[PDB]
């Protein structure tokens, strides 16, 4: 239920029903999608030598 650092850019840490449902149900973050194996992923920009 508790808030994991991994949720960053994948699930909104801040969208969930209050009460006993809390922690269980969470909305997908904006840019986020499922990878090949159904794992959560986030798009990121490359930075080459500075």
């Amino acid at each position: 239920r508790d808030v994991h650092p991994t949720h960053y850019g994948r699930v909104c840490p801040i969208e969930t029903p209050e009460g006993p449902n809390i922690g269980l149900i969470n909305s997908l973050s904006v840019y986020a999608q499922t990878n090949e194996y159904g794992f959560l992923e986030t798009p990121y920009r490359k930075v080459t030598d500075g």
């Binding site: 239920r1 508790d2 808030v3």
Partner: protein, 1362 residues
């Protein structure tokens, strides 16, 4: 059928025949097309009664003319359908089956009667093996297991004399043949010659079962069921949904299977089927039966056609969705309505807005009666037709009924009794209920869509109780503390604050006014601001001693605003009260003082006034919330960047390596704490004042009018902390768990946080909200348990005449006098007079209730300790005395005889727990605790004087304390204990004993996050048993080769290093054990679990140099988290994990029989001849030196005290004292004030039972656990007549057990363990006399409390008269 009692016992099979009217031979219910009942089926009309009123099956005979007519063709009796709720049927079971409940439920009376374990019985029952019933042959007697061919090897050789069988029928047989009478006598004779301890305990238990069994008259053979009773059809009805579909109870499906299998058994018997399949069928029979009673108790249960487990009879009674709690102790009710609440500023205190359409519906029947009596409608049918159209007339009749009717408003949860209040309803348009603002605090209601229920007490009596006892205006004071609940909130306070607050010049400074009315006239003309400082001529009024009017007439200095407010103020209250800028503080005080001195009606009226005022002036004031209203303190980034740059310097200075993990963590966190508080106070200064604009050149200052700040200081909404997060720095928060993050949030909500910072805060947020949910159900459940225990306590007597009582102190727990004597004792009856050398040798007459004014007088005397007559020390049976209880806080007076004080206490104590969870869980979006327990600071100039310690002076020159029993007090001019501080082990001191401390000088000092162990003597550190891996962990670096040893506790230790107690031995320059000055100890300082040993082997320590620092991380729950279970545990009388041990009687104690480090004590009493030897753990720490002259209940061990032990040694008053204080400590942490008397109530309930040594004329004997009430009843009757005496000792039971122990089995059955309690009472043949509350509740009778006292005592006298 107007009844006295309820008895429960085993149902006899032939008694079951008696109740049952007919045998259900067929599993069929009804015909598929014609849904009439089938012949001998489950819904049979011949057995259970006719489907439809006064009409038989075949339908020749109908009408009332036929009653008791018995249709010759069909065999249907002609009567009321209602009979199908009350006729039972029955089944003839072919194989006598055992009752599951008496097997699988613990302890299992069958098993305990036969002293036979479960498995044996199982294998027997399930036909896996045979067992010996009756052995003519000596080889084998009762209760021997035989296998398949062991039975054959037995039968072949013996037989004739040899009797054995298989299964439940065999067990039935063994049940009949066992000798009831003889065995009881046998056992006591066994006891007479020899009683090894545990053997005698079990033999005792068994004796109790047996005796109870034959007294109740329950026959053991009844354990085996021959006849199976069958539930009335209406209770398991069969109904069509309108779509053609059907619904049937789960009982029906279990029952059907029962019949199917039983009929197959009849077939198999007539066919003479082989043993294997006959046995299999008996298994199946047993299954079906036991599934029907309690499904799944037996292991894998029968499921629904769905998947869902079938719902058995047990589920029906027991479950929370069972009959008790859902349908019996509570239900759905008519004449109630429910809808959204809306504000009613215009409503009076005792009023409420009631929506048109709601009230129309509610008050339906009242309408009809008056419609017909006034003749507006010809009959009731026409009255209905006239209501359903709805003309002007209808509304008028409603008006007349609603006139002087009181209606009840309810909000869930029912936190306390004021969750329902009575009001005069006033009709309004719309569908919304209007609630009075004042009472929102009691309901804890707020306007964001909350709904309320509105019930109608219908009778004159209901109306009376609602208006008189439940009326809003009657109940202002919390039953919990004496103080008001119905009080100013938010806007109210704000308006008041606005008016009372004073301002530089503005308009009309220094005007002199002829009376108050002029003030308002001036404001309204705009010729003066309300903030303007003014001289007004006003007459303050005074109460006399007899109650007259005392007009005093002269000059007051106030604002315009305060003059207006003095208008509101009632005749006789001093000006002093309004003279100050009123906040939440001042407001409540006004009301309080007013109530206590003036009285009821005046206060009622005045409170309303104050409400309206506040609204008004809030409105003209025009207070709002703009972005600039939140002022970012001038020096924010300066103070922040400085703290940041310095922390950066210490991180760079990390790589250099004078930086352990502990020190760095400490350093970072402390610099951040100090920086935030700097920021806080600069933000507060800025916001707090800020009227420093130029007076044409130079500047000036006064109290500015910032709206947020005003809300803060007013106590209107904000507190300082919230402000801090808004305009200041948000601060540090808590990570996922206990972890506290190093870098804080420097920014504020004004600036806006970013990705990272906002993300950071979510952890705490989510954690908080999940707590508010899931952690509150614990508190609710706890409360219900309290409720159930505390029901029977009612005021029956005025005064039984007890002299006994509990000595209450002003609680000087460490740091200050957190709760004084006055606060703890107010409104209590005293027992005895206390003497103190005082202003003139104080004496105070006893049996006296101490009123407020009594208290004031005793305040001037300054008595410390007061014996007060307690609820516990009450002599009254089953309940308490008016005197022993004292004031009913809610009413202000002495409690009314008859009022149920038990539930009173419970509601008050459950209420806050439930609140103090929810609140800091949905408002405190992060986590921290005040743990800067750094320095002590003496406030006022006095002498330093120490009690209880022994220190040892070092090289640097600090007075370092090595005692666990240390306090540091403050003496004033002529010798008294004013101020008190609590200093832990290892704390450096400054001034020792005798010397004077000047104001605000640092007299004590210690580092918080680290308790050092400090040596008393000098020399070289010698290492004993600290090997690497076993008891310590090597942490070593390069550089010059420095390290820091960590001595690990039990968890990280391998299996070989379990008993190894790591030490640091004190040897000298020569080698030999240097001894601590004057004492015999070779100084061996036992470093505890995880003692991070900085000073390694080889560095000559000076006397008072640290050997090893002990870290204790107090993450800091606070809240009601750690609090809740601790409270619960004290109330459940649960011995804590490390209980300390005590001494039994008095006299010189000594050592003797010593194991390795297992201490032994042989206490031989100087008076008492006997020696008590008690063994002591090795790792257990002792507080005592050796030979002392001890008293009973002498604490020796370290830790929290086990409640039971305290009860046994000290006795009642001390244990009770400990409970009260220890509980109260938690709630004091939260600042929720509750009277000790409630806690006292509970404890008396927990003392309900005792243990008997020595026989009366009755059913006693050794070690029986009988009620305290039955002991005193025996006292009366036996002392007066003679007979042999009985010695008793009091016992302590916590909560659940105490509740289950009470002689009210329907009470206990309603609580928990429904199954178990029923069986015990059934075997006991117990008779419930029905004196308690919930009993009558469930029966729909008159509660024996209060209003129902009269009727209930009448039945009691009718018991005496035959």
């Amino acid at each position: 059928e107007e009844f006295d009692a309820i008895k429960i016992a085993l149902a006899s099979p032939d008694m079951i025949r008696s109740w049952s009217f007919g045998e259900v031979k067929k599993p069929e219910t009804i015909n598929y097309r014609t849904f009439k009942p089938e012949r001998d089926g489950l819904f049979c009309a011949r057995i259970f009664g006719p489907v439809k009123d006064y009409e038989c099956l075949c339908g020749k005979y109908k009408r009332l003319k036929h009653r008791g007519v018995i249709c010759e063709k069909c065999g249907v009796e002609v009567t009321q359908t209602k009979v199908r709720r009350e006729r039972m049927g029955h089944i003839e079971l072919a194989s006598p089956t055992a009752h599951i409940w008496f097997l699988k439920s613990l302890p299992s009376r069958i098993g305990l009667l036969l002293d036979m374990p479960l498995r044996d019985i199982e294998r027997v029952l399930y036909f896996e093996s045979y067992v010996v019933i009756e052995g003519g042959m000596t080889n084998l007697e009762r209760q021997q297991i035989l296998t398949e061919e062991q039975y054959l090897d037995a039968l072949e050789e013996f037989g004739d004399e040899f009797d054995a069988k298989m299964g439940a029928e065999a067990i039935q047989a063994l049940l009949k043949s066992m000798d009831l009478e003889q065995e009881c006598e046998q056992l006591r004779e066994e006891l007479n010659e020899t009683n090894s301890e545990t053997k005698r305990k079990k033999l005792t238990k068994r004796i109790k079962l047996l005796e109870a069994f034959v007294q109740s008259g329950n026959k053991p053979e009844w354990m085996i069921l021959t006849v199976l009773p069958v539930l009335p059809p209406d209770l398991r009805p069969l109904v069509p949904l309108d779509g053609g579909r059907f619904a049937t109870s789960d009982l029906n499906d279990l029952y059907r299977r029962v019949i199917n299998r039983n009929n197959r058994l009849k077939r198999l018997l007539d066919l003479a089927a082989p043993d294997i399949i006959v046995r299999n069928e008996k298994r199946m029979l047993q299954e079906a039966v036991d599934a029907l009673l309690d499904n799944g108790r037996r292991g894998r249960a029968i499921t629904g056609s769905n998947k869902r487990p079938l719902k058995s009879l047990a589920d029906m009674i027991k479950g929370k969705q069972g009959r008790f709690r859902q349908n019996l102790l509570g239900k759905r009710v008519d004449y109630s309505g429910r809808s959204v609440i809306t504000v009613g500023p215009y409503l009076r205190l005792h009023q409420c807005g009631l929506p048109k359409k709601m009230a129309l519906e509610l008050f339906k029947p009242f309408i009809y009666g008056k419609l017909e009596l006034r003749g507006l409608a010809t009959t009731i049918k026409a009255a209905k037709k006239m209501v359903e159209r709805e003309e002007a007339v209808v509304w008028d009749i409603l008006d007349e009924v609603i006139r002087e009717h009181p209606v009840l408003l309810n909000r869930a949860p029912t936190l306390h009794r004021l969750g329902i209040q009575a009001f005069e309803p006033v009709l309004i348009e719309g569908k919304a209920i209007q609630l009075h603002p004042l009472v929102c605090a009691a309901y804890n209601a707020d306007f964001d869509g909350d709904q309320m229920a509105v019930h109608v007490p219908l009778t004159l009596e209901a109306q009376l109780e609602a208006r008189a006892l439940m009326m809003s205006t009657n109940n202002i004071l919390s039953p919990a503390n004496g103080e008001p609940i119905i009080v100013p909130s938010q806007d109210v306070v704000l308006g008041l604050y606005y008016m009372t607050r004073d301002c530089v010049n503005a308009k009309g400074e220094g005007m002199v006014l002829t009376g108050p009315k002029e003030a308002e006239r001036l404001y309204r003309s705009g010729l003066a601001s309300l903030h303007a400082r003014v001289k007004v001529r006003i007459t303050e009024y005074e109460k006399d001693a007899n109650g007259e009017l005392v007009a005093k007439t002269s000059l007051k200095d106030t604002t315009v605003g305060r003059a207006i407010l003095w208008m509101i103020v009632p005749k006789g209250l001093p000006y002093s009260i309004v003279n100050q800028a009123l906040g939440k503080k001042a407001i409540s005080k006004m009301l309080n003082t007013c109530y206590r001195i003036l009285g009821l009606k005046p206060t009622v009226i005045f409170a309303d006034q104050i409400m309206y005022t506040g609204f008004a002036y809030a409105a003209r004031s025009g207070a709002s919330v703009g972005i600039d209203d939140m002022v970012i303190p001038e020096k924010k980034h300066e103070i922040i960047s400085e703290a940041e740059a310095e922390v950066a310097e210490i991180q760079e200075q990390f790589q250099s390596g004078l930086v352990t993990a502990g020190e760095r963590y400490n350093k970072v966190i402390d610099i951040w704490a100090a920086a935030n508080d700097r920021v806080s106070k600069a933000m507060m200064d800025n916001l707090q004042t800020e009227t420093v604009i130029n007076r044409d050149g130079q500047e000036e200052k006064q109290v500015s009018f910032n709206s947020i700040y005003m809300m803060a200081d007013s106590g209107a909404r904000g507190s300082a902390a919230q402000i801090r997060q808004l305009a200041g720095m948000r601060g540090l928060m808590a990570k996922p768990d206990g972890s506290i993050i190093e870098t804080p949030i420097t920014a504020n909500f004004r600036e806006g946080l970013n990705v990272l910072q906002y993300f950071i805060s979510t952890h705490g947020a989510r954690k908080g909200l999940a707590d508010t949910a899931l952690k509150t159900a614990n508190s609710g459940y706890l409360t219900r348990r309290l409720v159930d225990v505390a029901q029977d306590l009612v005021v029956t007597e005025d005064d039984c005449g007890t002299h006994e009582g509990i000595m209450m102190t002003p609680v000087i727990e460490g740091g200050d006098v957190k709760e004084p004597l006055r606060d703890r004792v107010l409104g209590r009856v005293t027992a005895e007079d206390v003497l103190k050398p005082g202003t003139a040798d104080i004496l105070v007459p006893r049996n006296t209730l101490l009123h407020e004014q009594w208290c004031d007088l005793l305040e001037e005397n300054s008595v410390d300790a007061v014996k007060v007559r307690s609820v516990v020390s009450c002599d009254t049976d089953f309940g308490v005395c008016a005197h022993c209880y004292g004031r009913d806080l809610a009413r202000g007076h002495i409690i009314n005889k008859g009022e149920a004080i038990g539930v009173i206490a419970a509601q008050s104590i459950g209420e806050p727990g439930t609140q103090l969870t929810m609140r800091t869980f949905h408002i405190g979006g992060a986590a921290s605790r005040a743990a800067a327990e750094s320095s002590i600071q003496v406030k006022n100039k006095g002498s330093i004087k120490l009690s209880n310690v022994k220190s040892v002076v070092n090289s640097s020159g600090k007075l370092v304390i090595t005692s666990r029993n240390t306090e540091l007090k403050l003496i004033d001019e002529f010798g008294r204990t004013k101020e008190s501080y609590k200093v832990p082990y290892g704390a450096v001191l400054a001034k020792g004993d005798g010397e004077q401390v000047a104001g605000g000088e640092t007299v004590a000092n210690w580092d918080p996050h680290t308790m050092p162990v400090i040596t008393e003597v000098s020399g070289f550190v010698r290492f004993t048993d600290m090997i690497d891996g076993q008891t310590i962990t090597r942490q070593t670096d390069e550089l010059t080769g420095l390290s820091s040893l960590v001595v690990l506790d039990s968890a990280e230790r391998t299996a070989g290093g379990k008993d190894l107690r790591p030490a640091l031995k004190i040897v000298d320059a020569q080698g030999n054990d240097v001894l601590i000055p004057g004492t015999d100890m070779p100084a061996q300082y036992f470093l505890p679990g995880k003692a991070i040993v900085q000073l390694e082997d080889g560095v000559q320590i000076s006397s008072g140099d640290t050997l090893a620092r002990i870290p204790q991380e107090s993450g800091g729950t606070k809240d009601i988290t750690g609090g809740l279970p601790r409270v619960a545990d004290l109330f459940e009388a649960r011995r804590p994990k490390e209980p300390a041990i005590l001494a039994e009687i008095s006299g010189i104690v000594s050592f003797g029989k010593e194991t390795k480090g297992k201490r032994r004590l042989v206490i031989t009493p100087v008076d008492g001849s006997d020696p008590y030897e008690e063994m002591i753990p090795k790792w257990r720490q002792l507080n005592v030196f050796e030979g002392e002259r001890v008293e009973r209940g002498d604490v020796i061990s370290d830790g929290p005290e086990a409640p039971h032990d305290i009860l046994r040694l000290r006795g009642v008053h001390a244990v009770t004292r400990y409970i009260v204080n220890e509980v109260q400590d938690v709630y004091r942490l939260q600042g929720v004030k509750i009277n000790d008397k409630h806690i006292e109530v509970i404890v008396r309930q927990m003392l309900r039972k005792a243990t008997i040594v020595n026989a009366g004329s009755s059913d006693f004997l050794e070690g029986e656990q009988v009620e305290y009430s039955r002991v005193k009843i025996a006292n009366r009757e036996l002392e007066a007549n003679g007979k042999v005496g009985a010695t008793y000792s009091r016992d302590l039971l916590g909560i659940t057990k105490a509740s289950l122990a009470t002689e009210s089995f329907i009470s206990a059955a309603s609580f928990q363990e429904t199954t178990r309690v029923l069986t015990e009472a059934a075997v006991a043949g117990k008779r419930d006399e029905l004196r308690g509350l919930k009993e009558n509740v469930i029966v729909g009778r008159l509660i024996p409390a209060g209003t129902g006292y009269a009727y209930h005592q009448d039945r009691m006298r009718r018991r005496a008269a035959g």
